Tab-separated table of C-alpha atoms and ligand atoms in Angstrom:
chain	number	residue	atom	x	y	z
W	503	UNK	CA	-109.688	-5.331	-48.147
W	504	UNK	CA	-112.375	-3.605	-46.796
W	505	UNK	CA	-113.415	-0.527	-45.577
W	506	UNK	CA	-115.557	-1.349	-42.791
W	507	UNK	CA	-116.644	2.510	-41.372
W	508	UNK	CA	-117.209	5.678	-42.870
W	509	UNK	CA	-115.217	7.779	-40.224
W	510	UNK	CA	-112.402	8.053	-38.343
W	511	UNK	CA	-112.106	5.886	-35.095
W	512	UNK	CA	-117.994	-1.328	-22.766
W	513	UNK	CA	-119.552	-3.656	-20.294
W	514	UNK	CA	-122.477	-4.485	-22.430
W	515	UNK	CA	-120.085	-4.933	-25.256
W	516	UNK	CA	-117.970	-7.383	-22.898
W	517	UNK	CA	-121.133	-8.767	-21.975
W	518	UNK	CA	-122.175	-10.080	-25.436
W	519	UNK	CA	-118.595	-11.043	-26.989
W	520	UNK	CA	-118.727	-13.431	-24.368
W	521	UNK	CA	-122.014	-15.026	-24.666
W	522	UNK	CA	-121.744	-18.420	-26.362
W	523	UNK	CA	-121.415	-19.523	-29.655
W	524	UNK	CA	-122.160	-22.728	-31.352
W	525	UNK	CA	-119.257	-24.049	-33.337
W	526	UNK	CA	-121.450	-23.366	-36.281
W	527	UNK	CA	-122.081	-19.706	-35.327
W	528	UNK	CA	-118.600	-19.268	-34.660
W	529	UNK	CA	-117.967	-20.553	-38.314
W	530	UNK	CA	-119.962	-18.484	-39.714
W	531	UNK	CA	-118.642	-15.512	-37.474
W	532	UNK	CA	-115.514	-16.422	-38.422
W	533	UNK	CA	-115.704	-15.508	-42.355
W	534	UNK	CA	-113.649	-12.495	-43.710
W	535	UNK	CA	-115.880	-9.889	-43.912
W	536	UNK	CA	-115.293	-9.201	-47.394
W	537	UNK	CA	-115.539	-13.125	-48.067
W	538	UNK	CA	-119.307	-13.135	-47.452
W	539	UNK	CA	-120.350	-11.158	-50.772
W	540	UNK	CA	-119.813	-14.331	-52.989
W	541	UNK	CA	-119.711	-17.224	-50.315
W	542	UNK	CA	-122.131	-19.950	-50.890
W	543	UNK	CA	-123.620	-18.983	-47.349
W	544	UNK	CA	-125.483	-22.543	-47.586
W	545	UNK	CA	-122.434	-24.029	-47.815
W	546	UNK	CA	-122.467	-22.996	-44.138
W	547	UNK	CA	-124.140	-25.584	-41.745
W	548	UNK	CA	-125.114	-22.990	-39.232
W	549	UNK	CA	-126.686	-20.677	-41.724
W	550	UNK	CA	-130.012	-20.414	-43.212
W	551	UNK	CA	-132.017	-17.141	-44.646
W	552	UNK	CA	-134.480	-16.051	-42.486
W	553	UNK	CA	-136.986	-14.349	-45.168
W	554	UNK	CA	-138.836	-17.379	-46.821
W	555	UNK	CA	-139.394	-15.488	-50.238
W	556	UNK	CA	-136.747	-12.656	-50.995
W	557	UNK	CA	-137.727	-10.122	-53.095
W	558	UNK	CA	-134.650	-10.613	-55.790
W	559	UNK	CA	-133.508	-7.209	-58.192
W	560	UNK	CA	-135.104	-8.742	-60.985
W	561	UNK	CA	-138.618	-8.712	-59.152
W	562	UNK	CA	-138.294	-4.947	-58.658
W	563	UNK	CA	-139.858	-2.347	-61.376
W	564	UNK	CA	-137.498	0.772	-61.510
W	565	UNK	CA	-139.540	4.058	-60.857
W	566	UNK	CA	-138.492	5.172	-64.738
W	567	UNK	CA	-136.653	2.835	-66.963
W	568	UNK	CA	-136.393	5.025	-69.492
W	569	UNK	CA	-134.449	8.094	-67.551
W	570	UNK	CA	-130.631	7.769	-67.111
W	571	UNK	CA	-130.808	7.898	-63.280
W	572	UNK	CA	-134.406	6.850	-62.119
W	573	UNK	CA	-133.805	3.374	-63.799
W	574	UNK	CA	-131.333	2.724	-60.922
W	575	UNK	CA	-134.612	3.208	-58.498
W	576	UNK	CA	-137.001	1.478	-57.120
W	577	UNK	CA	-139.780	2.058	-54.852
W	578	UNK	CA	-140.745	-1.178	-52.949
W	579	UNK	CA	-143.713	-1.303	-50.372
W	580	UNK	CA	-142.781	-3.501	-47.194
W	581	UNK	CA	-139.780	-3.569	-44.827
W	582	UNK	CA	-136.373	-3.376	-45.609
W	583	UNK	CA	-135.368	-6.993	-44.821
W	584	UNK	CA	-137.703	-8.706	-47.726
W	585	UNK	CA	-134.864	-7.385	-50.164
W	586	UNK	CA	-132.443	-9.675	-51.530
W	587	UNK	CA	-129.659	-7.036	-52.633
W	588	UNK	CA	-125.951	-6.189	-51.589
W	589	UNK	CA	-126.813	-4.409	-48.881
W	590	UNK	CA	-129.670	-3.077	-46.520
W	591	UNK	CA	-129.414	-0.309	-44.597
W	592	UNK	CA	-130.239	-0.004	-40.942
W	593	UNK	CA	-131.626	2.915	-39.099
W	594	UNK	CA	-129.153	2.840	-35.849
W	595	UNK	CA	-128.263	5.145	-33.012
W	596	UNK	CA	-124.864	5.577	-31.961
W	597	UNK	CA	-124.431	3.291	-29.545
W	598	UNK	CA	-125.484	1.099	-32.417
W	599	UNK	CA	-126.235	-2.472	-30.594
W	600	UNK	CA	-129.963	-2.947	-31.857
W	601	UNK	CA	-132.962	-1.049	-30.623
W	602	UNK	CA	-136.687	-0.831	-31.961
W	603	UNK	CA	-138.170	0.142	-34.805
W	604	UNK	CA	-136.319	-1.128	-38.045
W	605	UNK	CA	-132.853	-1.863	-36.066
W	606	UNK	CA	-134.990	-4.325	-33.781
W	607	UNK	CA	-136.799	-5.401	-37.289
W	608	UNK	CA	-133.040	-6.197	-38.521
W	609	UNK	CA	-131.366	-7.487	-35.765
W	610	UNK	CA	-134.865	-9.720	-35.268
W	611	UNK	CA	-134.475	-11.374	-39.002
W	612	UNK	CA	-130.063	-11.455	-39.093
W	613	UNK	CA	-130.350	-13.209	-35.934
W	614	UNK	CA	-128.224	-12.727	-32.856
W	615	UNK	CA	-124.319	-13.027	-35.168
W	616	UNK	CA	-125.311	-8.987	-35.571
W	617	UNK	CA	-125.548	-7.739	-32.494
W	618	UNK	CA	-122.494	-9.940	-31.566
W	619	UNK	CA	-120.766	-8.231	-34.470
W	620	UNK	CA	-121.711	-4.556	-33.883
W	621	UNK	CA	-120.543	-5.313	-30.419
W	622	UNK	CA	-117.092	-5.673	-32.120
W	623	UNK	CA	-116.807	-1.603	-32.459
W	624	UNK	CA	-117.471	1.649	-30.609
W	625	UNK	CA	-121.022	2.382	-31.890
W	626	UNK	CA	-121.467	4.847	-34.787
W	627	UNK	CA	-121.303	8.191	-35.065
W	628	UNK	CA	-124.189	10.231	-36.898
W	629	UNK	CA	-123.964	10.767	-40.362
W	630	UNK	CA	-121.317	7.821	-40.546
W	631	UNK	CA	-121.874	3.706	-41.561
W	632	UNK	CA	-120.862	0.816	-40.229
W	633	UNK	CA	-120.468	-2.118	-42.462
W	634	UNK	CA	-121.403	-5.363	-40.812
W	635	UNK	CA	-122.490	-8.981	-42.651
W	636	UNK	CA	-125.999	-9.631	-42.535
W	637	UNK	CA	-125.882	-13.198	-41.169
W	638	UNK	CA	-129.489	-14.744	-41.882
W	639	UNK	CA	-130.559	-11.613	-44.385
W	640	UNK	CA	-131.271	-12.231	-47.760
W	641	UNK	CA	-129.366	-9.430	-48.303
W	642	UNK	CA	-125.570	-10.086	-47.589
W	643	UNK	CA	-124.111	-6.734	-45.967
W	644	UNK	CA	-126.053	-4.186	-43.324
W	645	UNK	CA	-124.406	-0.680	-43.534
W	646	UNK	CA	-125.789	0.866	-40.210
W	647	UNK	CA	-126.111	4.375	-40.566
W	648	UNK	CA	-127.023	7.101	-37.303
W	649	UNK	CA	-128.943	9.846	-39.013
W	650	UNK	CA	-130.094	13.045	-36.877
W	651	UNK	CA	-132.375	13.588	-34.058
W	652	UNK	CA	-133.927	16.472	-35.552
W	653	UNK	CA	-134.074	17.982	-38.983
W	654	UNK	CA	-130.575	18.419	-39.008
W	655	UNK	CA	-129.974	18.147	-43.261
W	656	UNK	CA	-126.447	17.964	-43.809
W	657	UNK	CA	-126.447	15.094	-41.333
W	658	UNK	CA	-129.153	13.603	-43.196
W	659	UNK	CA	-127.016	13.881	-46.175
W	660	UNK	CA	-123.883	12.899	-44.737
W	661	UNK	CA	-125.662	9.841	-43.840
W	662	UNK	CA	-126.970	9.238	-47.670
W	663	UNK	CA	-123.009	9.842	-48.317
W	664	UNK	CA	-121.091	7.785	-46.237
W	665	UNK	CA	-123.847	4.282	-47.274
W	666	UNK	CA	-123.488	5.182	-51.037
W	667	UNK	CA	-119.574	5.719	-50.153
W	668	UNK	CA	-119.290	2.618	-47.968
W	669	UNK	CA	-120.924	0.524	-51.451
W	670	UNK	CA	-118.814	2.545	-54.141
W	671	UNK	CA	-115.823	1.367	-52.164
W	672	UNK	CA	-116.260	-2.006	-51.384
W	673	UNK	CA	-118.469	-2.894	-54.325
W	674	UNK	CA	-121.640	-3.403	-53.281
W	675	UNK	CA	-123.726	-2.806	-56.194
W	676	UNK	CA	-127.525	-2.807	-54.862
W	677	UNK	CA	-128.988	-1.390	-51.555
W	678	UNK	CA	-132.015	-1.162	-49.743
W	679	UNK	CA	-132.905	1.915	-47.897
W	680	UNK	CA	-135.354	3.055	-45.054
W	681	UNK	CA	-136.216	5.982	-43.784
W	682	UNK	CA	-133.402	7.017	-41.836
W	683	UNK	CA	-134.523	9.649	-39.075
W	684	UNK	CA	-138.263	9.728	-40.101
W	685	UNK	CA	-139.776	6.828	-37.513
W	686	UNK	CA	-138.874	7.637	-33.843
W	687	UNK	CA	-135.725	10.333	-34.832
W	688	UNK	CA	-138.458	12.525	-35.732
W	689	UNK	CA	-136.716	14.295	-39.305
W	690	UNK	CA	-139.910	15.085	-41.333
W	691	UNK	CA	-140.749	12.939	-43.791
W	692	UNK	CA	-141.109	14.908	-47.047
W	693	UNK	CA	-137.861	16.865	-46.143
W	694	UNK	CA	-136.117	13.537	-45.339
W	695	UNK	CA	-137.004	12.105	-49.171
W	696	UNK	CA	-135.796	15.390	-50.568
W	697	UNK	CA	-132.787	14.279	-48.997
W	698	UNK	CA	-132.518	10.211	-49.856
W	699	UNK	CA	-133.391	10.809	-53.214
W	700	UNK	CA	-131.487	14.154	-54.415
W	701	UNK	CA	-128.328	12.707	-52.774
W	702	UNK	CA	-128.856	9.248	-54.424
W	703	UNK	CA	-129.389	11.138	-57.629
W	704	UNK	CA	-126.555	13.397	-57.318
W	705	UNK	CA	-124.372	10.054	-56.386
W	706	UNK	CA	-125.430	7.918	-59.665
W	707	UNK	CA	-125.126	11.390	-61.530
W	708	UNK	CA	-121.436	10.796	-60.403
W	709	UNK	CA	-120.532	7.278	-60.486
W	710	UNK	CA	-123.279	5.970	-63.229
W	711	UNK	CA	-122.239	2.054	-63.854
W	712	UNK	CA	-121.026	1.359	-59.708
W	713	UNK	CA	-124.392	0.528	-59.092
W	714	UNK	CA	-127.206	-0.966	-60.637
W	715	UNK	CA	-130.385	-0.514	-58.155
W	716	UNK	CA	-131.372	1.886	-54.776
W	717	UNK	CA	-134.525	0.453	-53.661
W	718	UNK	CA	-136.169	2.736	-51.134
W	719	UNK	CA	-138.370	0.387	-48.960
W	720	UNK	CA	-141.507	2.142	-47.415
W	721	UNK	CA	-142.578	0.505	-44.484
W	722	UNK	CA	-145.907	2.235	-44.134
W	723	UNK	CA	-148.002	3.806	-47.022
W	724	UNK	CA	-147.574	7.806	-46.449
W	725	UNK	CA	-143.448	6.870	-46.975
W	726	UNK	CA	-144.630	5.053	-50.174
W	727	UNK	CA	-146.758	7.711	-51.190
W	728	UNK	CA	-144.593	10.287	-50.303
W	729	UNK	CA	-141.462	8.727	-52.749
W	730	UNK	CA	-144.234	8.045	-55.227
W	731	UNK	CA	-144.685	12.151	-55.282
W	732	UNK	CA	-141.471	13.354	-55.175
W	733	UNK	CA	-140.184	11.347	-58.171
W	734	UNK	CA	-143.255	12.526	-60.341
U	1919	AR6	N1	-140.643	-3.163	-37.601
U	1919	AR6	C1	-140.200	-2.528	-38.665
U	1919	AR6	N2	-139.810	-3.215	-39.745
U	1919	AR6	C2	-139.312	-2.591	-40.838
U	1919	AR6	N3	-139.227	-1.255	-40.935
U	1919	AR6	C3	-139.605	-0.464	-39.869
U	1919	AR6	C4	-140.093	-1.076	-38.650
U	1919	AR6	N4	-140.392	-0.093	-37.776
U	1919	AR6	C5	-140.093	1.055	-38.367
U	1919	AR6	N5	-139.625	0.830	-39.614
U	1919	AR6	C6	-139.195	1.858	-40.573
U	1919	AR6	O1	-137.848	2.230	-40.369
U	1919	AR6	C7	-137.619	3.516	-40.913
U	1919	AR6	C8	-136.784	4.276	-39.871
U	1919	AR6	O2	-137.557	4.505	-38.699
U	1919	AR6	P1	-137.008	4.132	-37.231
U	1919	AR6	O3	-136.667	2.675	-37.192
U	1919	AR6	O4	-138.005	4.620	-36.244
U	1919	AR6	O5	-135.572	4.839	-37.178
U	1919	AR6	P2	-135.150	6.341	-36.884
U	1919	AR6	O6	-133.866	6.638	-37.617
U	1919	AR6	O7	-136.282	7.350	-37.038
U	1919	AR6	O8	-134.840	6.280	-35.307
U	1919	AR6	C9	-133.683	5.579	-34.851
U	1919	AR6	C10	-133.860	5.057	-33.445
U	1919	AR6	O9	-134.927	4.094	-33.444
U	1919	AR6	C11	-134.393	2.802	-33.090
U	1919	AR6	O10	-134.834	2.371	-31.796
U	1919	AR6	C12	-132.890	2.921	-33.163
U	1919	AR6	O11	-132.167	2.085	-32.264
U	1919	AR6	C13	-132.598	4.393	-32.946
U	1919	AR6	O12	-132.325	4.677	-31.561
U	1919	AR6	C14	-139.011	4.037	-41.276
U	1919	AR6	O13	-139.205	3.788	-42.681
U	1919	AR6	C15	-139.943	3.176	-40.447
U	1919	AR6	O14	-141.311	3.028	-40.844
């Protein structure tokens, strides 16, 4: 069974559980959260994926793949949604029912089963993860994560922690990152990739053979540029 959030445990909450559902939504809604890794989600007649060409692991180069850790990572230039994996992550605030930047992106592409989904809990708290499905992703799970407003590093961290612990326990064995905190949080960018990667590191360091790819997806070119740096 699953472990849904990282932590320990509303009238626009009430609001959206009781807009309607098609039968077919509901159906899909309806599937055991832990069921939707290996379902065959077109066996589903009110699914379809969103993203007309996923990018798949096997289309990914790993930054190294010749180093023990920097095979498991991959640099990937366009938004978080194009990837096919386990899991994406989302860049959320704690209320954590959509919002711009790549949580708009997200909800935008998964279609409105995530937002009726997130509605199911009390928001997030920063540094934790939520672990929803990812209805018309390519990618199969979202683990929404609430980083700092501010350059606030063992938050930051935490946040790395509790998306690479959500995965470890559940099984997820790929996910796609953003840039948690760096768009309209404000965390500085270089510091912020200091973060992501030494705390990805430090995590397949630990628990080499869980997973087999972190793709850090760079949504603009100084992001790129800036993981292309800091992993020589
Ligand atoms: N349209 C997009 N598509 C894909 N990726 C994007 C998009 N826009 C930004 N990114 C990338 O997304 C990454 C994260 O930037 P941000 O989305 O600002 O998130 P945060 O943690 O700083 O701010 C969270 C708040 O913003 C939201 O309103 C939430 O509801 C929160 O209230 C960067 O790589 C961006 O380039």
């Amino acid at each position: 069974e699953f472990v849904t959030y990282s932590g320990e445990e509303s009238p626009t909450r009430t609001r959206i559980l009781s807009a309607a559902l098609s039968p077919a939504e509901r159906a899909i809604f309806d599937v055991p959260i832990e069921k939707w890794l290996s379902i065959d989600r077109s066996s589903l007649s009110g699914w379809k994926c969103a993203v007309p060409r996923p990018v798949t692991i096997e289309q990914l180069r790993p930054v190294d793949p010749s180093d023990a850790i920097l095979r498991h990572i991959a640099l990937y230039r366009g938004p978080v949604t194009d990837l096919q994996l386990d899991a994406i992550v989302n860049a959320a605030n704690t209320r954590c029912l959509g919002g711009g930047g790549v949580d708009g992106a997200i909800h935008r592409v998964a279609g409105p089963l995530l937002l009726r989904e997130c509605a199911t809990f009390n928001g997030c708290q920063t540094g934790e993860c939520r672990l929803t499905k990812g209805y018309q992703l390519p990618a199969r799970y979202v683990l929404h994560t609430v980083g700092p407003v501010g350059e606030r590093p063992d938050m930051l961290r935490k946040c790395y922690r509790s998306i690479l612990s959500l995965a470890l326990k559940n099984g997820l064995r790929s996910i796609g990152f953003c840039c948690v905190s760096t768009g309209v949080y404000g965390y500085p960018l270089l510091p912020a990739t200091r973060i992501a990667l030494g705390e990805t590191r430090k995590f397949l360091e630990e628990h080499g053979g869980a997973l087999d790819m972190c793709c850090f997806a760079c949504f603009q070119e100084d992001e790129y540029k800036t993981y292309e740096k800091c992993v020589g």
